[PDB]
């Protein structure tokens, strides 16, 4: 058995496509090159067979279909946002409260 090293366009690549799938959790997926974070949620919107990944008004991947399974999953980001702290003056007291 002998091979060729970078003498032609590549044809025989090894399988590097992760191991399993994750549901109901925001983890970093890699859908054949595109990388994104979100929660895979079932979608009631009908998907045409040729379509692979969706696009929102932000031009980001919000919908996708499985490369093998015919099922379709929506990308919804998990809990995120700014946090604000309310407090009185330091001379009066030091009690604080959290607010999202």
């Amino acid at each position: 058995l002998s091979f060729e090293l970078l003498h032609a366009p590549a044809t025989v690549c090894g399988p590097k496509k992760s191991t399993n799938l994750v549901k109901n959790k925001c983890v970093n997926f890699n859908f054949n090159g595109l990388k994104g974070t979100g929660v895979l949620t079932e979608s009631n919107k009908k998907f045409l067979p040729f379509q692979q990944f969706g696009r929102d008004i932000a031009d980001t991947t919000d919908a996708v279909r499985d490369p093998q399974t015919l099922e379709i999953l929506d990308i919804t980001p998990c809990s995120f946002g700014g946090v604000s702290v309310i407090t009185p003056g330091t001379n009066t007291s030091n009690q604080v409260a959290v607010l999202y």
Binding site: A58, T60, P77, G81, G82
Partner: peptide, 22 residues
């Protein structure tokens, strides 16, 4: 709300967020 204000209200229709007014 008086119907004038109701008509006026009816005639008006990723990090970024909208703060509700006080």
């Amino acid at each position: 709300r008086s119907p004038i204000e109701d008509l006026l209200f009816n005639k008006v229709t990723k990090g970024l967020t909208v703060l509700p007014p006080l």
